[PDB]
Amino acid sequence: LSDEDFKAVFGMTRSAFANLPLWKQQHLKKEKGLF
Numbered sequence: 001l002s003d004e005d006f007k008a009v010f011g012m013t014r015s016a017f018a019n020l021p022l023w024k025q026q027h028l029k030k031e032k033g034l035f
Helices: 003-010 022-031
Strands: none
Touching: none
């Protein structure tokens, strides 16, 4: 996705998301139907 779309879908920037636990990044992406 674009950085703008990512922020819209996940409610934070990529940089922010990358600070979450790896399993949680995986979970949040799968919950939204993304990889």
